[PDB]
Amino acid sequence: KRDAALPSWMPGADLPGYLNGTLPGDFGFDPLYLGQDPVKLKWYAQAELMNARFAMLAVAGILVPELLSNIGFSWPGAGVAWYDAGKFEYFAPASSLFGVQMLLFAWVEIRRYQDFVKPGSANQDPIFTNNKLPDGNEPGYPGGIFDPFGWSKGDIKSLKLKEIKNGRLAMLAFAGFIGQAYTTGTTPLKNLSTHLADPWSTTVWQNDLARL
Amino acid sequence: VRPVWFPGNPPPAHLDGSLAGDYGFDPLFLGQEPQTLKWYVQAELVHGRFAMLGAAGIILTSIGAKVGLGFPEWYDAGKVVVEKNNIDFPTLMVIQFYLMGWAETKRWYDFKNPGSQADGSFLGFTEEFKGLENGYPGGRFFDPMGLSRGDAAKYQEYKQKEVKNGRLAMIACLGFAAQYAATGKGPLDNLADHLADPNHVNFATNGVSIPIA
Amino acid sequence: SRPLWLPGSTPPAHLKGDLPGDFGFDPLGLGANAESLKWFKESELVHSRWAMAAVAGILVQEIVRPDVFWYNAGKEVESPLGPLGLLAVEFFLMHWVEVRRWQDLRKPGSVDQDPIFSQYKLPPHEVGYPGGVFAPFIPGDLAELKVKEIKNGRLAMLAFVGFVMAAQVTGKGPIAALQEHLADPWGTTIFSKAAVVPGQAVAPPCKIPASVSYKGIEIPTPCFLQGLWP
Amino acid sequence: RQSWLPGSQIPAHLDTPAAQALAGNFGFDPLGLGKDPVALRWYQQAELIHCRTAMAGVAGILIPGLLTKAGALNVPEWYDAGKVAIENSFAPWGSLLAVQLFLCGFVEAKRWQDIRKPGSQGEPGSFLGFEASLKGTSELGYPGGPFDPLGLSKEADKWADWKLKEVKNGRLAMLAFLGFVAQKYATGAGPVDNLAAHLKDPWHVNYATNGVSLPFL
Ligand code: CHL
Ligand code: CHL
Ligand code: CHL
Ligand code: CLA
Ligand code: CLA
Ligand SMILES: CC(/C=C/C=C(C)/C=C/[C@@]12O[C@]1(C)C[C@@H](O)CC2(C)C)=C\C=C\C=C(C)\C=C\C=C(C)\C=C\[C@@]12O[C@]1(C)C[C@@H](O)CC2(C)C
Numbered sequence: 001k002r003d004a005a006l007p008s009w010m011p012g013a014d015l016p017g018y019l020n021g022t023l024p025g026d027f028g029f030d031p032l033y034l035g036q037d038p039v040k041l042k043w044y045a046q047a048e049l050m051n052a053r054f055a056m057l058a059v060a061g062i063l064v065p066e067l068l069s070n071i072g073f074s075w076p077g078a079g080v081a082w083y084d085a086g087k088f089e090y091f092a093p094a095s096s097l098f099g100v101q102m103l104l105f106a107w108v109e110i111r112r113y114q115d116f117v118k119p120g121s122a123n124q125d126p127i128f129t130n131n132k133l134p135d136g137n138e139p140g141y142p143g144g145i146f147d148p149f150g151w152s153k154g155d156i157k158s159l160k161l162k163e164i165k166n167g168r169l170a171m172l173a174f175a176g177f178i179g180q181a182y183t184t185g186t187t188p189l190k191n192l193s194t195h196l197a198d199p200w201s202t203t204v205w206q207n208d209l210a211r212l
Numbered sequence: 213v214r215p216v217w218f219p220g221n222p223p224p225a226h227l228d229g230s231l232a233g234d235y236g237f238d239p240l241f242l243g244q245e246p247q248t249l250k251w252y253v254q255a256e257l258v259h260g261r262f263a264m265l266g267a268a269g270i271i272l273t274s275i276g277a278k279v280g281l282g283f284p285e286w287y288d289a290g291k292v293v294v295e296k297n298n299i300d301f302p303t304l305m306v307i308q309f310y311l312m313g314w315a316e317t318k319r320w321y322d323f324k325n326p327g328s329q330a331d332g333s334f335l336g337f338t339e340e341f342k343g344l345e346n347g348y349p350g351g352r353f354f355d356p357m358g359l360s361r362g363d364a365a366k367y368q369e370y371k372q373k374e375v376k377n378g379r380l381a382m383i384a385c386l387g388f389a390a391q392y393a394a395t396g397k398g399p400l401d402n403l404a405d406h407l408a409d410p411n412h413v414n415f416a417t418n419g420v421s422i423p424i425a
Numbered sequence: 426s427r428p429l430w431l432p433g434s435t436p437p438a439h440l441k442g443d444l445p446g447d448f449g450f451d452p453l454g455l456g457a458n459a460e461s462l463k464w465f466k467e468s469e470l471v472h473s474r475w476a477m478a479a480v481a482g483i484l485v486q487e488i489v490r491p492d493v494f495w496y497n498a499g500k501e502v503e504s505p506l507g508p509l510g511l512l513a514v515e516f517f518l519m520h521w522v523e524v525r526r527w528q529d530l531r532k533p534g535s536v537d538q539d540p541i542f543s544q545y546k547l548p549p550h551e552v553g554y555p556g557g558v559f560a561p562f563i564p565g566d567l568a569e570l571k572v573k574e575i576k577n578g579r580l581a582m583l584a585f586v587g588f589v590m591a592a593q594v595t596g597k598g599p600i601a602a603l604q605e606h607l608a609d610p611w612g613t614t615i616f617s618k619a620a621v622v623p624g625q626a627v628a629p630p631c632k633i634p635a636s637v638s639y640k641g642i643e644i645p646t647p648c649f650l651q652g653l654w655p
Numbered sequence: 656r657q658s659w660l661p662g663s664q665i666p667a668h669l670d671t672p673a674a675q676a677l678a679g680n681f682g683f684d685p686l687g688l689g690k691d692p693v694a695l696r697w698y699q700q701a702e703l704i705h706c707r708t709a710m711a712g713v714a715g716i717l718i719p720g721l722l723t724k725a726g727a728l729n730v731p732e733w734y735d736a737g738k739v740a741i742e743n744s745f746a747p748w749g750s751l752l753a754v755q756l757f758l759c760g761f762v763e764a765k766r767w768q769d770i771r772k773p774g775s776q777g778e779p780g781s782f783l784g785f786e787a788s789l790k791g792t793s794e795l796g797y798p799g800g801p802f803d804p805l806g807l808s809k810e811a812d813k814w815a816d817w818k819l820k821e822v823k824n825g826r827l828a829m830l831a832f833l834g835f836v837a838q839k840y841a842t843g844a845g846p847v848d849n850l851a852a853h854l855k856d857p858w859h860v861n862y863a864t865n866g867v868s869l870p871f872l
Contacts (some may be wrong), residue, residue, distance in 0.1 A: 012528050012535025039812050200510030209509075276652045279628070283652075295842040302872045321662030328662030362457020364437065407624050 025164035049140045052167025059170045254347040262379020262402035267381040274400040287396040394420040473578025480581045487598045496592045498637045593648045596632030619655045628654040644648035659683040679822035703796045706825020713828040720847040732845045841867045
């Protein structure tokens with residue numbers, strides 16, 4: 001029932017009606033019909049943004065620090081694998097940092113949830129009542145102070161599509177870090193260098209067959 | 213009119229020739245009741261179809277043994293396969309009853325309530341399990357080539373061919389067992405002996421089938 | 426009304442001559458179902474097209490590279506890309522090509538558009554006969570060409586099977602085997618090296634090794650249905 | 656109409672609108688235990704309490720078991736934890752159980768009287784002003800109120816979905832515990848250790864080769 005004008009993950013394939021192009025990155029991909037129920041699909045829409053946005057930060061936070069180290073840039077945290085940052089010693093114990101993390105995140109996340117439950121109800125500064133977000137914001141897209149440079153005032157639809165495409169690719173990359181790190185046992189950029197050294201004999205088929 | 217197993221004897225009333233392979237053979241009237249006849253019609257086909265797979269498999273492996281390719285006789289394959297491949301027999305037996313139990317339970321409740329397995333309950337498949345007749349599933353899974361969906365006249369001809377090769381295979385599988393018990397050699401080992409000296413090598417001289425001999 | 430495989434016979438009802446190469450041969454009635462014939466039509470073209478390319482390759486290999494046996498070309502060939510490097514490219518490239526061809530068979534006209542470049546597109550066509558870029562040049566009438574394609578294709582499919590059984594029995598290439606036939610035509614036929622009669626059965630020996638060692642692994646190499654050979 | 660066995664005849668008592676209002680109704684009642692409408696109402700409560708108790712208990716055997724293997728905790732096997740805890744304990748197991756029966760008996764007794772007279776625990780003055788919140792909801796076995804702090808039962812659209820998830824995970828949890836008991840006698844190891852053994856060599860380490868389940872083989 002989905003129209004044929006919209007982009008399709010599989011050209012010439014029938015696609016669900018409930019994926020009608022409203023959401024960004026709507027390519028009609030749902031072989032398991034997870035998002036069939038509108039109430040559930042409403043939740044999954046925000047979950048994708050949240051998992052995507054954190055994934056984009058996480059991937060950026062796992063490649064750039066390693067990229068700088070190879071270039072030779074020197075800082076005390078240089079040369080630490082992304083999966084060894086936890087063991088590293090900081091100014092405060094890991095437990096104390098974790099406790100502060102949850103208290104800070106509890107405020108912002110409940111603030112974000114309140115808007116999702118009732119959009120527009122969490123757009124006012126509790127202390128300095130003069131401050132406020134624009135009233136037209138939708139769940140997942142606060143705007144206002146969260147968009148200081150006004151990029152959202154342009155072609156918003158294209159920007160939403162660009163965000164979700166980069167976000168979906170970032171989420172796949174992070175799963176690659178866990179799979180690659182758990183198998184190869186080395187940092188991600190090291191795996192890329194190995195592949196570029198000998199692309200033909202360094203496939204996952206070669207690597208995994210050797211192990212077993 | 214139509215030929216019967218005993219020429220000159222009228223066929224039974226409950227056998228009207230509609231079924232495939234009907235020669236009016238029911239001396240004990242086991243299928244007099246119409247509903248019981250449906251059960252046996254499908255029982256015969258399942259027995260016949262398994263026998264055809266069994267006979268073809270036994271014959272083919274026997275040819276492999278005679279030619280020297282190293283196949284064991286059908287009465288030793290079970291022991292050889294398990295030992296050579298290091299397979300736990302009780303695990304293999306259990307796996308068989310899960311797969312056979314699922315597949316054969318579906319056939320059971322299609323007989324009880326025809327068309328019930330095509331309701332989309334099983335992974336969303338709604339037309340491959342509907343069934344065409346009693347004992348003839350049809351569909352694009354059990355009949356991928358659609359030979360039951362083409363010519364109607366030839367499909368009836370095949371039903372005649374299926375049952376008669378099935379009955380012949382069932383008799384053959386009894387021959388394999390009886391010959392092994394009497395002789396202790398493989399199927400084609402017996403065939404080679406008969407062709408050597410047919411007059412002096414057969415069941416009447418094996419010393420078992422005719423004890424008074 | 427049209428030439429038939431067995432002159433004087435009546436073609437089956439489901440065969441009427443519409444398709445190219447339709448000579449009324451269908452003793453088992455596999456094409457009776459309309460949908461089944463549509464699928465079987467595609468597979469015959471694909472099988473024939475692959476066979477024609479394969480048969481031509483084997484002949485050219487022997488002429489150009491007589492030393493290498495086309496049967497053993499799998500292990501004989503050495504390239505920097507390695508075994509699994511070649512397979513990886515082959516899998517992904519073939520998966521794309523075959524799926525698109527498959528999609529057109531299911532829902533024709535849906536995969537004609539070029540994904541990357543918008544302007545380019547495939548003109549309307551029949552299933553199994555793509556046009557446009559695939560057919561820059563056409564020597565003559567398509568109807569005649571389609572008949573030529575299948576008739577050569579059907580011959581090629583038999584030709585390849587001839588190579589395999591000749592290769593497995595005689596242990597030689599296609600041209601090399603033919604030269605043997607011309608040398609002693611009477612003593613080289615399959616009748617002159619195999620025979621089965623009541624009480625005795627003689628079959629040729631499989632000249633392909635039972636197993637092949639290739640880069641630290643053993644590849645089984647069985648002769649096709651060697652137990653049923655005449 | 657989903658059923659545990661396609662093509663079978665659903666029992667008539669399970670096809671009534673009252674019966675179909677029950678979560679997880681797949682027509683499974685071969686022994687006809689729910690034929691009497693009054694009995695089915697009682698057995699539905701029994702399933703919910705077994706479901707919820709089993710889920711809490713299984714979570715208490717499984718999650719500590721995995722974390723123990725991962726090295727984040729040190730908890731004995733579920734079948735040994737009773738003996739280990741009682742050692743470094745402030746009370747013997749006789750005193751500990753006696754208190755458990757008073758507290759559980761008192762709480763269970765109030766739940767019992769609500770099954771006999773739904774909403775009867777909101778009797779004015781019966782409790783110290785707290786009886787107002789003990790009336791339960793319109794559905795038996797789903798008390799709500801103080802038992803639903805986040806108010807997830809106030810969304811009508813999601814209500815039927817939530818109840819189905821509870822019964823499905825509850826039935827799965829009930830079978831899990833029966834597996835823990837059977838696997839302790841059969842294999843003499845922990846639940847997570849049994850899973851590790853199966854994954855190592857699935858085709859040789861299973862119940863078909865444990866030497867107990869199939870004595871004839
Ligand atoms: C996105 C979330 C997230 C993910 C995927 C990881 C993933 C990881 N963390 Mg990290 N963490 C995450 C969030 C956080 N971590 C920490 C604090 C730590 C610490 C302190 C440690 C890790 C470690 C680990 C690794 C656990 C596996 C291992 O080697 O165990 C084997 C574990 C060890 C060899 C460590 C033994 C000594 C350690 C002091 C014992 C206590 C460890 C804690 C129980 C860890 C708790 C982590 C939880 C909260 C995520 C793994 C790479 C460990 C690591 O880097 O190992 C190399 C580690 O020690 N994380 C905090 C608090 C700020 C987080 C907050 O969100
Ligand atoms: C109350 C419990 C309950 C019971 C007793 C049954 C009983 C049955 N159901 Mg089931 N069902 C039940 C609940 C439900 N069923 C269904 C839906 C269905 C359907 C749709 C079907 C059945 C069928 C069957 C029958 C299967 C017979 C057989 O040999 O299976 C053999 C069992 C198996 C092959 C699966 C179990 C194998 C093993 C124990 C677990 C292995 C797990 C590993 C991960 C395996 C991995 C191996 C890989 C890696 C190689 C059987 C009578 C089938 C039938 O016969 O219908 C006529 C059928 O088609 N049930 C639902 C969803 C609505 C249920 C919900 O509670
Ligand atoms: C049309 C495909 C094709 C055919 C007909 C042959 C035929 C042959 N190859 Mg060749 N090969 C083919 C493709 C390929 N070969 C090779 C690599 C080799 C090697 C290294 C060797 C041969 C050998 C042989 C011979 C013996 C085969 C045998 O007994 O296998 C027995 C059967 C098997 C080993 C496995 C059969 C697999 C099955 C038919 C298909 C599996 C499908 C996949 C799971 C799907 C995923 C893959 C992708 C690409 C679709 C025979 C002449 C051997 C030889 O020279 O003998 C003298 C030999 O040593 N081939 C590659 C490069 C990766 C191929 C790529 O397409
Ligand atoms: C963001 C996607 C992404 C990318 C660019 C890479 C890149 C690489 N991976 Mg990684 N990987 C990914 C995701 C990705 N991976 C995921 C999701 C997993 C978990 C299953 C893994 C698990 C994994 C293993 C176990 C190994 C690699 C390895 C490799 C190397 C290539 C050889 C190989 O065996 O690949 C195998 C990888 C795949 C088949 C990826 C499939 C899934 C992705 C999402 C497909 C995306 C396709 C799409 C057209 C985009 C392509 C990339 C884009 C930038 C153009 C290379 C460094 C090997 C290595 O380190 O060699 C030294 C290796 O051993 N990867
Ligand atoms: C089914 C087709 C097929 C296959 C699978 C093979 C396979 C093989 N050939 Mg053969 N060949 C074929 C057809 C085929 N050939 C045809 C039709 C010809 C005549 C032109 C030849 C002529 C030929 C020669 C002369 C030689 C081989 C050799 C080889 C071997 C090594 C190939 C190599 O190193 O490539 C390396 C690859 C390249 C350098 C790049 C090739 C790029 C090609 C031309 C792209 C074609 C694309 C096009 C769309 C294909 C359309 C047809 C296709 C759909 C079937 C290998 C066993 C060699 C051999 O004997 O080794 C022992 C050898 O010397 N072949
Ligand atoms: C409550 C329950 C388990 C509770 C477990 C608890 C509290 C465990 C607690 C602890 O572990 C911890 C956490 C930590 C440990 O250190 C200590 C202990 C104390 C050990 C399981 C119920 C488990 C209940 C089970 C398995 C019930 C199964 C019932 C079945 C199959 C009935 C089937 C049918 O009746 C129908 C439905 C319809 C009829 O028509 C047909 C038939 C077939 C008769």
